[PDB]
Enzyme design. Structure first.
Site, mmCIF file in Angstrom:
data_model
loop_
_atom_site.group_PDB
_atom_site.id
_atom_site.type_symbol
_atom_site.label_atom_id
_atom_site.label_comp_id
_atom_site.label_asym_id
_atom_site.label_seq_id
_atom_site.Cartn_x
_atom_site.Cartn_y
_atom_site.Cartn_z
ATOM 1 N N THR A 1 0.875 -1.191 0.000
ATOM 2 C CA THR A 1 0.000 0.000 0.000
ATOM 3 C C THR A 1 0.904 1.230 0.000
ATOM 4 O O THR A 1 2.015 1.205 0.536
ATOM 5 C CB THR A 1 -0.932 -0.202 1.204
ATOM 6 O OG1 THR A 1 -1.802 -1.298 0.871
ATOM 7 C CG2 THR A 1 -1.742 1.023 1.657
ATOM 8 N N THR A 2 0.423 2.312 -0.577
ATOM 9 C CA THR A 2 1.001 3.606 -0.408
ATOM 10 C C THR A 2 -0.127 4.576 -0.132
ATOM 11 O O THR A 2 -0.933 4.798 -1.004
ATOM 12 C CB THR A 2 1.681 3.917 -1.728
ATOM 13 O OG1 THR A 2 2.755 3.002 -1.988
ATOM 14 C CG2 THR A 2 2.221 5.333 -1.744
#
Lengths: 228, 244
Positions: A1-2
């Site tokens: 995830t970012t």
């Protein structure tokens, strides 16, 4: 995830990639990690999706009750504290990294990081998820205070894209949302219009010379492309 | 011995229930709700007898959640207790099913809370009539329809086209019965329904109303939220009625 959130004058922007993964295989390529908690408060979820869906749902349930009682829109700090406490009480049982951000008339745009372990820190920007460790230097080098809404959306889109081009565990769409005194603005950018990828970056076009032909010289030139 | 607890008299009547209904008129206020084509309206008395009271703090209208409003008639603090349980019920329903409680189902849960005190001993009954107002979606075409539900101290839950509750309700309900015969309420404009409701009050109270004397709430197809109607929009209804 970012995930990430950034303050600008009057509001915040939240941004995220769209990938959910089992490690090696993508089970959902179009998740929505920007979750609504109240009209102008959102969070960005990272970690276990099961955990952060359950804590966001619970935080939202509490805030809607509180707004009916008080009869007033809720401040960001309240969202952040409710969540924080849930993240602290369950710290040993979950994997969660959260960003709460929002707009409210008393304190304007605000951003809280709530990382693993359940601390809560009030910042001008926050990064989170696996892809975050690629953006510290980006932001140190390229981020500025004073950005307008439009500069900040664009900057977030470009940060996410830098992160997800190098992080195996991020990818897909880039979703953003901008929260301020006006109406919420959401945006989704498809991978085919991403502002950065290594596939389209001209310094990675020509291939490394790992496979030179059998030659009578130590000079290295090109990869062998056809049988001799 | 039956006048003091939840036991049947010899005629199968419950006395505490009947007296809880008297608590309702004892409070001296009249409420009228009315359902028109696209909306539901509620018109209650705003009495501020004391020149020193902050009039924006006296209210009978409350939100149960974004989309459901109530009007309390009767013993006021028993009202607010039910507003709090209704809010808790609404919030539990939403966490369990993930969608906001429909107004029909809310009303039924509050009715069950009343019924239970008619059957166990030791807790007083709430001396109120709760009128719930909101829009409900039909399964067929997905259109939204205005509702009015009333729950009373006996635990009875019913839906209405219009209804007066409180002091002089008998005189006001008869006035609405007369004006039903001209045209069904569900065919009326907001303005036209309003003129009926406001004149039901004026007939019954025996007065002339200013905008400061009533508070008014409203749910409509255009905006599903339960919201107070601002004083200007009520002056324009009261002006329309003094004329015609």
């Amino acid at each position: 995830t970012t995930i990430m959130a950034v303050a600008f004058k009057g509001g915040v922007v939240l941004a995220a990639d769209s990938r959910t993964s089992t490690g090696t295989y993508v089970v959902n390529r179009a998740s929505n990690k920007l979750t609504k908690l109240a009209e102008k408060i959102y969070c960005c979820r990272s970690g276990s999706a099961a955990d952060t869906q359950a804590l966001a749902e619970q935080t939202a349930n509490y805030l809607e009750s509180y707004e009916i009682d008080t009869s007033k829109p809720v401040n960001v700090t309240t969202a952040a504290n409710i969540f924080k406490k849930l993240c602290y009480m369950n710290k040993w049982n979950i994997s969660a990294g959260i960003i709460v951000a929002g707009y409210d008339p008393l304190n304007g745009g605000s951003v809280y990081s709530i990382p693993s372990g359940g601390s809560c820190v009030k910042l001008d920007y926050a990064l989170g998820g696996s892809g975050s460790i690629f953006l510290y230097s980006f932001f140190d080098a390229n981020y500025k205070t004073g950005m307008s809404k439009e500069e900040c959306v664009c900057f977030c889109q470009r940060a996410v894209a830098h992160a997800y081009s190098r992080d195996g565990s991020s990818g897909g769409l880039i979703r953003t949302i901008a929260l301020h005194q006006g109406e919420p603005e959401d945006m989704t950018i498809p991978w085919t219009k991403t502002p950065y990828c290594m596939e389209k970056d001209p310094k990675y076009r020509d291939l490394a010379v790992q496979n030179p032909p059998f030659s009578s010289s130590a000079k290295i030139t090109v990869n062998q492309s056809r049988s001799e | 011995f039956d006048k003091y607890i939840t036991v049947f008299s010899p005629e199968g009547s419950l006395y505490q229930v009947e007296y809880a209904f008297k608590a309702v008129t004892y409070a001296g206020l009249l409420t009228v709700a009315i359902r028109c084509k696209d909306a539901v309206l509620v018109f209650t008395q705003h009495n501020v007898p004391d020149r020193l009271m902050r009039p924006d703090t006296i209210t009978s209208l409350h939100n149960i959640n974004k989309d459901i409003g109530t009007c309390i008639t009767g013993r006021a603090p028993d009202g607010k207790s039910l507003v709090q349980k209704a809010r808790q019920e609404a919030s539990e329903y939403k966490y369990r099913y993930g969608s906001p409680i429909p107004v029909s189902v809310l009303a039924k849960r509050v009715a069950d809370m009343a019924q239970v005190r008619t059957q166990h001993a030791g807790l007083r009954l709430m001396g109120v009539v709760m009128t719930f107002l909101g829009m409900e979606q039909n399964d067929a075409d997905g259109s939204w329809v205005p509702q009015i539900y009333c729950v009373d101290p006996a635990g009875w839950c019913g839906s209405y086209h219009a209804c007066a509750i409180g002091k002089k309700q008998i005189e006001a309900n008869a006035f609405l019965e007369k004006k039903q015969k001209n045209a069904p309420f569900h065919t009326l404009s907001q303005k036209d329904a309003a003129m009926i409701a406001l004149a039901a009050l004026q007939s019954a109270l025996g007065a002339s109303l200013k905008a400061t004397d009533v508070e008014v709430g409203r749910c409509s197809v255009e905006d599903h939220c339960f919201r107070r109607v601002p004083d200007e929009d009520v002056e324009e209804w009261l002006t329309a009625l003094a004329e015609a």
